[model samples]
Target: NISGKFIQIRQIAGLNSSLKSSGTFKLTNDGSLLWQQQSPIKTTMQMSKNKLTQTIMDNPPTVLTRDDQPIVFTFTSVFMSVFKGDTKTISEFFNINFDGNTQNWTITLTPKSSPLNKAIKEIILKGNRYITNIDVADTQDNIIKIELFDITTN
Candidate 1:
């Protein structure tokens, strides 16, 4: 498992506004992700192979699946792939541009298929060994920037 603290910035399209949040995250080798947001609001998102669950404070968890939420599933799958360093899966879904070496590398991914291409503009990942930053740019010009720090793995 890998655990870290993250700062996320979201730039809203056409709104000329931005939102920032801080969180903690855990990613396991089994393809499970736990994202806990602690500031602005308390919320948690958990994703497994086939399901995504979200909880807001005392509210009951909201669950989503590929059959009911394909777009969300696509996003979760891509996020999981990036965290797991599943380059083969990523390559199958996106056109990849890789630069630098393993010690310091960056990957820029442009969606190639239907749903992903329709929703996402590009995804940029930068890291040395573990991913340190991620930038997701969507079709509407919205961007989500995530910076990870204090990372530890076991």
Candidate 2:
């Protein structure tokens, strides 16, 4: 498992505005991800291979299954694959470009097929032994940038 602090910036293309949030995230070996937002709003999101549960403050959790939102499930799976460094799985959906050496490297992925290509333009990951940064650009011209720090693994 890995745990870390994260800062996320979401840019809305049409509005030309961006929202920023800071959080903590934990990703388990079994592909479960728990994200807790600390600022702007107190929210928690737990994601697994088949479902996602989200809550705000003390509110009731909202659950979504892959059957209900396959696109969101695919997006989450992509993230899990990146975190696990499962290039074979990622390559099945994307055309990959790996650059730099082991100490510092970047992986750029562009969608290879439909559905995924219809929503995402590209994804970029940068790191050494662990991923420290992720930048995603969607077909709508919106972007999401995430920076990870203070990471620990077990």
Candidate 3:
């Protein structure tokens, strides 16, 4: 069981105040992930294949596919890659730079395309055996940081 807290702070234009929340993050060997938050409110997001789906109480499913939602798609894709250690997929999308040794490591990813560059400025991940932190900074000042702990592969 992989569990953690995800905190997102938005600093984009048209936003008056930053949005902050703490919740649970779960990943499985079956290549599926669930992000459930309970701080400010109850929200859950499931990521699978090329789509990101969200489920809320009494509401129909809201899905975002890569073709339709590139930013959201990239977010989930990065999470999946990091959790599964798919270095190839991670490099394919971003120009990567690695630092540190066996005990701990930091990976920095820069967008390679105009479209992706527009949505994200950079992505930084640091961890030892399992990823401990993921930080995503968008074009402006928006940011999403997910901190993972107590992760179990089996």
Candidate 4:
């Protein structure tokens, strides 16, 4: 398991206010993500393999699955590739622009064709050892910036 801070900076076009949140995260090598937020709101979300479970404040948990919604298939695939480092699978879905050395690195992934391009504009990732910053820009100009710190690979 890996423990770190997970930050999200959301910027939406035509919106006067941008939203930002930071939380603790525990991520596993098997496509599992546990995020616990402490500010602006308190919530917990656990996602693994084919399922996503989320809890907010004193509310009941909500569950979702990839099979129940086709939208999760590509999302899970992209998340796994980015977190797990599957170059072969990544290349199959995106045309990547890779740069940097071991001390620091940056890679930008642009959707190659079809619905992927329509849904996503690009994904930019940067880090020194493991991925630290991730910027995902959607076609609508909505950007989600996620920063991961205190990463562990072992």
The best candidate in terms of lDDT? 2
- Model 4 worst lDDT window (10 residues): 67-76
Pick the winner on TM-score between candidates 2 and 3: 2
The candidate, 1 or 3, that scores higher on TM-score is 1
lDDT of 3 by residue, 14-63 (tens): 68876777777888777778988777878788986655888775578798
In model 1, the clashing pairs are none
Best first by lDDT, ranked: 2, 1, 3, 4
1-154 per-residue lDDT for model 1 (tens digits): 8889999998988666689999898889988989999998999989987779989987999987666766556666776787776789888889999999989999999998887788889989899887889898889888989898999997
Tell me the tens digit of each residue's lDDT in model 4 across 1-154.
6778778899999899999998887778867878788777999878777678878987999997655543345544665576767878888878988898979999998988887778788888888767788888888889988888877655
Clashing pairs in 4: none
TM-score per candidate, in order? 0.90, 0.90, 0.85, 0.85
- Supply every candidate's count of residue pairs whose N, Cα or C atoms clash at under 3 angstroms: 0, 0, 0, 0
Tell me the lDDT of candidate 1: 0.85
Ranking by TM-score: 1, 2, 3, 4
Could you tell me the lDDT of residue 13 within candidate 3?
Answer: 61
Mark the regions of model 3 whose C-alpha exceeds 4 Å error after superposition: 13-16
Clashes of 2: 0
